[PDB]
Design a protein around this ligand. Structure first.
Ligand SMILES: Cc1ncc(C[n+]2csc(CCOP(=O)(O)OP(=O)(O)O)c2C)c(N)n1
Ligand SMILES: Cc1ncc(C[n+]2csc(CCOP(=O)(O)OP(=O)(O)O)c2C)c(N)n1
Ligand SMILES: [K+]
Ligand SMILES: [K+]
Ligand SMILES: [K+]
Ligand SMILES: [K+]
Ligand SMILES: [Mg+2]
Ligand SMILES: [Mg+2]
Lengths: 382, 326, 382, 326
């Protein structure tokens, strides 16, 4: 052969390669729909404590999702997106992570934060845009971020974080950080040009990164049958030279195992890893979407909790109450706080405020001195 | 024959008239098949077929390149970008390709039968990525036309004009007006000249220029102005951004002697700049007061600070006061 | 399973899929380095006439490439890009095409036009930017185009034509044109976001399109080892659900066969096809590049021409002379023509000239009336 | 200690000083490893390593997203876009991400240690895609800084300032000056304030503003001006486009009373607009003549018509004549 671009024997025969889409890449699963471990050789370590944290946070997220969605249906908050049916996805992966590892997301992985013990107060603060929000109420709800729990602030433009994450991973590599980077995205976002960029760069520059795709069958109204025709996302990884795997997104153990392995090898070989978690978006794409116009994780892990005598109905009954009380307690507290001081819309554009930008600042000031009665000054801070 | 319509309904109307008249016309984008996120293409896929109204993958750069591809064929391509904030992934395809298709081929090929619609301007709380007004970015680009309507009637006429213009056109639809006040809109096709500003209220003391939702705002600032300072304002709707009606403007200003332009988009680099600098050159003698620009702040679009960000009627009015009090 | 995004049995075992890059996709070849047909069952129809056209145009292109490159090295033309080593690539594919089929290219497939009998006069006219150039000297040399030979005008931004081509193919499908569309691009361009877009859309919308990739081992200074880590481009096609094949780019028959088959099935099934032609960029990336700072088709088909007694040294000797004379004859003619009238830089921006744009036109006029002595008015038309 | 340098050499210099000082600094882009297409990163990969200077795949949107990724880490990312004409595939990454990184995170994360270099302006015959001046496009975008140098000395100071500024900066390098006249340039690091215009020749009759290669042109139009019309022109180099030195300008104009801005970039939407409209508002009383704009035509950049396209010294001069003859 000798051709610089690829290595392969010749072939006397003209044969086009056909996509194997019928029996595509197998979906990896550890426990069945009844919390039963299929193949013991796959049962993870996982002490009762850790397994209960996975449960309590999937359910704490679910309890929170309800209170916030309703909150939206009452004009209390302007927007909201649920995680229904994708809780295993967040908690499994997160648990397989080292707390110092960097996370880059889309907007449907609030569970990652719940697991990393993000304060209910702050979850509510961001959605309300009140003073406690470190974001200073500048973005829409659900666009969380925490420099402390290493969760890169989420942005709306889909797939943009992918290439960014890879860059971040490269930086890591150079520092010999023993740290890996995880980048979440939906199957829809994978169609974006940045995904192509992200995967190639990651492989070409040899970066310690895990690509976590949430193939939940939908992208708002668009069915996967319209986003691609190959064997989903898992089947693209290899084309880029990326070790790839598919997992049962409703199996927290299968997600955990895959993630744990991907992290080990990624940080060890400085080799990109792709995990496609098959799942289903149970709730509406967002508060602004009536999913009925176009078209379980917790249950399973619960059984596994019974089969081991690690949980009972009384214990469960109490958890509903506590989590409820706790969520609702952060809820009220976030509700009655005033939004930041209006001067904050001009800061942080740059590190230092440009003189001209400051002139616009002072301008709003003079302006409010005269017409402030027509503004909601009472709702904001100062 | 005429029916009362919502901005979003007049759009479906214009889009219906188009597929109905042009056997070639095709509508595509993200989530357009089932009617769209704002209900602009509702029913259309059923009335015309799966190969005339359909979903594309979630990739804006492909959406536009794809549209340019069809257009080159002489076929009408009506691409949709769910939010104007998400048109940048396709900026290269628009500026380096589309705006330069005809020119670089010496008129051998073109994508003049290409039209891109996209929800524009702010809404309740779009924050940073459901509120932008990209108009100015495309203004520095020869080859494309940029049109922004101010009501259901203007929408259907302008859109249809865009769809049939022989030049790639970007049609920005103020999403805040999609469900605002209705109005009688002709059931059948009809056009409105592109590159023609519309004076909807003549005045004699000041010329007010805006577009999109802002028009309704400068319209209010007018009511206030005279009623509170006895000043007759001439309200003008620019409509077309790139090939802009330079004349209708300069004429008015010559009669007025004062100019105040406003737009949600940020001040710096915003389109009001090109207008000011131009009118300054043209009506240099008629100008009694420095040209005024009431635009959004030089910052990204705030979620909770929107009320304080926008060039609301009060910001304009006060700006008008100081100008006049010149 | 039941997951909406993919169909596949589950799996008790945790196994990451590893890219098969060692024995990647086989490189298809019909004749050896000595014009000998390996597997007779692959020998194409191809009458002496057609086979000689393939030869004369690969060589006519080669003869032209030399005269223009030298022409650049003399300041006669501002820029130039050769095709050395990739002639089989252009002629094979083109011959397998129906003349009415649409072509979208990058800039290194002048052979496609040579085969479609594009006038030497026009090749020279564009590079010189003289009056006969239908492009009106508006783009750099090598940016050819012909509405008559259905060759979409080439543009510099890499990979942009890919998605455009697919759109064009969709239009075709709707017209029941029996026409297919071919879109050429280098292995480097495939890294662009638009490539990802192009391939997915093509499959997702079921379009009659052939993606022809010229994997010539380089992208200016960048070696393929830095553009990707998968099994080249051929291995990505399947991930998108695209029938894929790899071919010996220096084997005109292997290219022809692959192309002919891709066209049949593409127009028949409205199914995208990808062909990666392995080859090697013999010349510098462009006139502006010293390839020695970082790092055969004709020969083969010649042998095949001898082994069949279809060509001899005397016949060859004469062809060198004729083609030489003919090329050089178009050369001189293009040289002595004046460039278009300066007013042409304002036309075609839009279909109709905007009034304001016309004001700038008239402005240059007033301007030249006064200072034209400082301009090269004598070199231009009118 | 100082050595005479080419624009491209001063760039290697600044880039060398940076990798030398900052253990974190990294340079990447298309064909940057072997030295670059213009020789800007020559030797650097050998002097510092394969993981500090390297090639990325051919994808500009990835190049910038990648750069933003490193920057977020606090590490210095110096991305290269071979041609300014090819920065649009990355426009979304620059406007929606980078320019909005700090703001949207309430200062929790930023890509302030990100710098993008890119060959700018025209050359012999770049035609449409090796000649563009994208500057104005990015000007309508809060969050990024845009710097353009006019000589080897200015290049190294400004670049180094950009590389160390705590805000994403786009550094446009006039490729036509890469091998032009040399000049003594300090061997070691040194900075030049960003957002500071430089008056390189004070005058009293007219203020001339330009940047990049144009500066040398308005500089010539000066020589001519006085020598042929007895008019003292104050030549100003803007240097920084987005956060622009509004004051240095308005001051000069106040002393002068007349303003002429010029730039290769197209007239419509070009940056001269923001300057004119601003100075008009500020120095409204001092203005004796309408502000003048000598820019490229509202068309794509021609291959063979370049000589007739550009705002050469003669176009400026004549423009100056009419202004003064006001
Ligand atoms: C660049 C860009 N284009 C369009 C949108 C609008 N949009 C928001 S969410 C969405 C689809 C969701 O897709 P998927 O990746 O499947 O995620 P999910 O919400 O289903 O988990 C779209 C098209 C966007 N945010 N960014
Ligand atoms: C969008 C874009 N970025 C950068 C360039 C500059 N550029 C021109 S040719 C080239 C590499 C050539 O790549 P390949 O696809 O392998 O084609 P070849 O010339 O080797 O056949 C690059 C990076 C460009 N033309 N367009
Ligand atoms: K994002
Ligand atoms: K059109
Ligand atoms: K192209
Ligand atoms: K910086
Ligand atoms: Mg999804
Ligand atoms: Mg190549």
């Amino acid at each position: 052969p000798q051709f610089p671009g690829a290595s392969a024997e010749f072939i006397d025969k003209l044969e086009f390669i056909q996509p194997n889409v019928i029996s595509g890449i197998p979906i990896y699963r550890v426990m069945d729909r009844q919390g039963q471990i299929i193949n013991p050789s796959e049962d993870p370590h996982l002490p009762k404590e850790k397994v209960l944290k996975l449960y309590k946070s999937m359910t704490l997220l679910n309890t929170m999702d309800r209170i916030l969605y309703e909150s939206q249906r009452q004009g209390r908050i302007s927007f909201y997106m649920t995680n229904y049916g994708e809780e295993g996805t967040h908690v499994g992966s997160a648990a397989a992570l080292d707390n110092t590892d960097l996370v880059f997301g889309q907007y449907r992985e609030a569970g990652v934060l719940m697991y990393r013990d993000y304060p209910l107060e702050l979850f509510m603060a961001q959605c309300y845009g009140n003073i406690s929000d470190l974001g200073k109420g500048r973005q829409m709800p659900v666009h969380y971020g925490c420099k402390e729990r290493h969760f890169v602030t989420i942005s709306s433009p889909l797939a943009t974080q992918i290439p960014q994450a890879v860059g971040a991973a490269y930086a890591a590599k150079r520092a010999n950080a023993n740290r890996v980077v995880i980048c979440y995205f939906g199957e829809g976002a994978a169609s974006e040009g940045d995904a192509h960029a992200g995967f190639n760069f990651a492989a070409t520059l040899e970066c310690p990164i895990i690509f976590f795709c949430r193939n939940n069958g939908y992208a708002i109204s668009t069915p996967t049958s319209e986003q691609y025709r190959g064997d989903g996302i898992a089947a693209r990884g290899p084309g880029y030279g990326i070790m790839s795997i598919r997992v049962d997104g409703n199996d927290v153990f299968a997600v955990y195992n895959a993630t744990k392995e991907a992290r080990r090898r990624a940080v060890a070989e400085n080799q990109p890893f792709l995990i496609e978690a098959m799942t289903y978006r149970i709730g509406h794409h967002s508060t602004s979407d009536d999913s009925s116009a176009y078209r379980h994780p917790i249950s399973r892990l619960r059984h596994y909790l019974l089969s081991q005598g690690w949980w009972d109905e009384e214990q469960e009954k109490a958890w509903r109450k506590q989590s409820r009380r706790k969520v609702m307690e952060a809820f009220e507290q976030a509700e009655r706080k005033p939004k930041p001081n209006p001067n904050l819309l001009f800061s942080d554009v740059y590190q230092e405020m440009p003189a001209q930008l400051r002139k616009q600042q002072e301008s709003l000031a003079r302006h409010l001195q005269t017409y402030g009665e027509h503004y909601p000054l009472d709702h904001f801070d100062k | 024959q005429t029916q009362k319509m919502n901005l979003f309904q007049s759009v479906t109307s214009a889009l219906d008239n188009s597929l109905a008249k042009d056997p070639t016309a095709v509508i595509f984008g993200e989530d357009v098949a089932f009617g769209g996120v704002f209900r602009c293409t509702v029913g259309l896929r059923d009335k015309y077929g799966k190969d005339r109204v359909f979903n594309t993958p979630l990739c804006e750069q492909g959406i536009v390149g794809f549209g340019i591809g069809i257009a080159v064929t002489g076929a009408t391509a009506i691409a949709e970008i769910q939010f104007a904030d998400y048109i940048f992934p396709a900026f290269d395809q628009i500026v380096n390709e589309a705006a330069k298709y005809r020119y670089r081929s010496g008129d051998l090929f073109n994508c003049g039968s290409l039209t891109i619609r996209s929800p524009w301007g702010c809404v309740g709380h779009g924050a940073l990525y459901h509120s932008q007004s990209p108009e100015a970015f495309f203004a520095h680009c020869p080859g494309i036309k940029v049109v922004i309507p101010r009501s259901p009637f203007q929408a259907k006429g302008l859109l249809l004009s865009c769809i049939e213009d022989k030049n790639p056109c970007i049609f920005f639809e103020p999403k805040i007006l999609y469900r605002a006040a209705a109005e009688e809109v002709p059931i059948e096709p009809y056009n409105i000249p592109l590159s023609q500003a519309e004076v909807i209220q003549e005045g004699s003391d000041v010329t007010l220029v805006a577009w999109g939702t802002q028009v309704h705002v400068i319209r209010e600032v007018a009511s206030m102005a005279k009623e509170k300072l006895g000043v007759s304002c001439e309200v003008i709707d620019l409509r077309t951004i790139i090939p802009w009606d330079v004349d209708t403007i300069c004429k008015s200003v010559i009669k007025t002697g004062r100019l105040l332009i406003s737009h949600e988009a940020p001040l710096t680099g915003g389109f009001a700049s090109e207008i000011s600098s131009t009118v300054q050159e043209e009506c240099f003698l008629n100008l009694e007061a420095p040209i005024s620009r009431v635009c959004g702040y030089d910052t990204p679009f705030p979620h909770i600070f929107e009320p304080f960000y926008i060039p609301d009627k009060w910001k304009c009015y006060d700006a008008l006061r100081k100008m006049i009090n010149y």
